[PDB]
Amino acid sequence: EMEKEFEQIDKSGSWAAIYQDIRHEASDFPCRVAKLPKNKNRNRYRDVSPFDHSRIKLHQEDNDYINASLIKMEEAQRSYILTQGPLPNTCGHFWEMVWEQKSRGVVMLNRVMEKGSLKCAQYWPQKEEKEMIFEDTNLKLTLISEDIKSYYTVRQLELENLTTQETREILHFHYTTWPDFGVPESPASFLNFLFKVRESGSLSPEHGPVVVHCSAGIGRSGTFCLADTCLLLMDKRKDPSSVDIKKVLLEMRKFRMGLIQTADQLRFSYLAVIEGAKFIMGDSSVQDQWKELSHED
């Protein structure tokens, strides 16, 4: 059971060893497509690639490659697309993927500039009156509104397929204070944000998979999705004891390499799931407590 394990790991001080076991046992599958010469400029990082089996294929229209992976959690019955922060030349591909996959939400866990460097392109419009057109992929993207909180911002975007003139509302959930290779300020801040994404309907099985990204699309993205899937598994069963967090992470790692990048992000995932379990099992009042503790105003 997770809380008993958490205490024993903490008391023995063995998070590094536990994390190392995950690193050791993780799946290794080919990434031949990602490594083709023609795709080099579509990858942000040499050593972060989608496995071939689970990569998202673009539907237009000469090169189908994007650095993105479908994490399909069979038992939990939820899917996510995890991807790198788009590059200056892949913003059109990114939105093409959102359109083709029928995603309703995009969760962004990094900032455009981190540590002095550009870790993600400015792939969405910052001003309503300055929409973006992706001419390569024939999409237009307009900012409709934004709700700026202290440590996250929610935006309503309108994405239009210019080929058909169909439009869709996309919700963008931007966590602005999660440091790279670090953790959220508290379980409460993280869970307040995850529940905002949940409350939006963006994770509904009636939509395509939510798109989740950070800079590499593995460390912060892996942490978010691990906590969400674990909470969903225990919710379906109404049984916190049934959930094996390390097994769930190894399952996720069958679909994309490197998910969760540090031992402390693994520790944080346990903290977030143990805390969130209080809400799942019917202490509704905890949600308000997280909102207060997160100091979102």
Ligand SMILES: CNC(=O)[C@@H]1Cc2ccc(NS(=O)(=O)O)cc2CN1C(=O)CCc1cccc(NS(=O)(=O)O)c1
């Ligand atoms: C120090 N590592 C790097 O700078 C690069 C670039 C980079 C930048 C940002 C982030 N953080 S995130 O939250 O934005 O995903 C991760 C990575 C991963 N990188 C790697 O080289 C990863 C290589 C890799 C791939 C698969 C597994 C592992 N190791 S494991 O411990 O996760 O099993 C490492």
Ligand SMILES: [Cl-]
């Ligand atoms: Cl930013």
Ligand SMILES: [Cl-]
């Ligand atoms: Cl900076």
Ligand SMILES: [Cl-]
């Ligand atoms: Cl960039």
Ligand SMILES: [Cl-]
């Ligand atoms: Cl950072």
Ligand SMILES: [Mg+2]
């Ligand atoms: Mg204005």
